[PDB]
Amino acid sequence: GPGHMAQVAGAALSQAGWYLSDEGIEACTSSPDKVNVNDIILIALNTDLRTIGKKFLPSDINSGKVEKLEGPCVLQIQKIRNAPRMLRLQMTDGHISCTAVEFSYMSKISLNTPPGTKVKLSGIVDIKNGFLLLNDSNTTVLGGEVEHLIEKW
């Protein structure tokens, strides 16, 4: 019934790398009697993690003191700046901001990639002087957009 269905949906979300708060998951669920992980994910893709996400990044991730970050985990792109292409990404878990550099041959992130886009990081990601080092091996674009995204609330 609704209790066990919410439980198995919550398990599926965590297994996929999402870190949403309990209140966030309720917000993304259209009814306690119509729990559908696809629809929870669709709404979350198109929602600001500052509103629905749970903290999972280390507070000092930009300090240099953190050297690695293990996936799976879903992050949100706040801003993008521009042989493979190289982009600089400002990202957030909804609580802590971090910065990445991304090298992509297959070109699935561009400077046109909308703010609010979600990406999933997989495996162990190196962080070199505060920059996460991303490439096509450890980064998957999940999509979504957060319209009219404001970087600083």
Numbering used by the authors: -3 to 78, 91 to 161
Passage from the reporting paper:
Topoisomerase III (TOP3) is a member of the type IA topoisomerase family, which functions mainly in relaxing the supercoiled DNA and in resolving recombination intermediates during meiosis and DNA repair. TOP3β is an atypical topoisomerase that can recognize both DNA and RNA as the substrates12132223242526. Eukaryotic TOP3α and β are unique in that they interact with their specific auxiliary factors, RMI1 and TDRD3, respectively, and coexist with them in the cell. We determined the crystal structures of human TOP3β TOPO domain, TDRD3 DUF1767 and OB domains (DUF–OB) and their complex at 3.44 Å, 1.62 Å and 3.6 Å resolutions, respectively.
The N-terminal DUF1767 domain of TDRD3 is composed of four α-helices, followed by the β-barrel structure of the OB-fold domain. The DUF1767 structures of TDRD3 and RMI1 are topologically similar but differ in size and orientation relative to the OB-fold domain. The OB-fold domain of TDRD3 contains an insertion loop between β2 and β3 (Val79–Pro92), which is 23 residues shorter than that of RMI1 (Val95–Ser132). Concomitantly, the C-terminal region of the TDRD3 OB-fold domain is not folded into an α-helix, contrary to the secondary structure prediction by PSIPRED. Limited digestion with chymotrypsin cleaved the C-terminus of TDRD3 OB-fold at Trp161, which is positioned in the middle of the predicted α-helix. This result suggests that the C-terminal region of the TDRD3 OB-fold domain is unfolded in solution, consistent with the present structure. The insertion loop of TDRD3 is completely disordered in the apo TDRD3 and becomes ordered upon binding to TOP3β with some flexibility, as judged from high temperature factors. Comparison among the two apo TDRD3 structures in the asymmetric unit and the TOP3β-bound TDRD3 structure exhibited two different conformations around the N- and C-terminal ends of β3 and β4, respectively. β3 and β4 in one of the two apo TDRD3 molecules and the TOP3β-bound TDRD3 are one residue shorter than those in the other apo TDRD3 molecule. The Arg93-mediated hydrogen bonds stabilize the shorter β3 and β4, which might be appropriate for binding to TOP3β. We found a positively charged area that could be considered as the potential DNA/RNA-binding site in DUF–OB of TDRD3.
